[PDB]
Amino acid sequence: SHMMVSQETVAHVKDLIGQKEVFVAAKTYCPYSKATLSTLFQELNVPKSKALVLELDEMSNGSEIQDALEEISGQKTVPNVYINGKHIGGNSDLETLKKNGKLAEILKPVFQ
Numbered sequence: 001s002h003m004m005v006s007q008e009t010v011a012h013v014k015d016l017i018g019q020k021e022v023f024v025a026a027k028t029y030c031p032y033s034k035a036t037l038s039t040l041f042q043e044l045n046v047p048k049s050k051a052l053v054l055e056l057d058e059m060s061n062g063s064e065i066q067d068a069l070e071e072i073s074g075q076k077t078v079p080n081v082y083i084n085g086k087h088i089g090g091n092s093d094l095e096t097l098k099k100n101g102k103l104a105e106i107l108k109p110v111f112q
């Protein structure tokens with residue numbers, strides 16, 4: 001579908017992003033996504049209750065969600081991470097924020 005992704009799907013994806021503090025469009029096969037999930041949930045202990053992780057490969061409309069996410073930011077890759085309104089981007093971006101110390105600042109409201 002790609003750029004044919006509907007307003008409705010895109011609106012729905014925005015709703016999903018807003019549903020939990022931590023949003024990750026993931027792919028179980030994607031190493032960077034496994035890294036991101038590991039970082040958020042294992043290393044940084046983000047409670048799963050505070051996250052929505054969409055395994056796009058496990059979703060029948062996972063492709064359309066990816067397309068929606070691409071419309072929303074331009075990002076074509078997984079993982080696609082949002083935290084508290086912030087489009088973090090992919091794993092390498094998460095990594096930069098982790099090292100920056102900014103990820104912790106971003107996550108502060110999450111643990112609260």
Ligand SMILES: *SC[C@H](NC(=O)CC[C@@H](N)C(=O)O)C(=O)NCC(=O)O
Nearest residue numbers: 030031032076077078079090091092
């Ligand atoms: S692993 C799947 C792949 N993801 C990336 O190349 C991520 C980019 C990287 N800098 C990061 O997130 O740190 C990908 O999304 N390939 C295309 C697809 O259709 O999924």
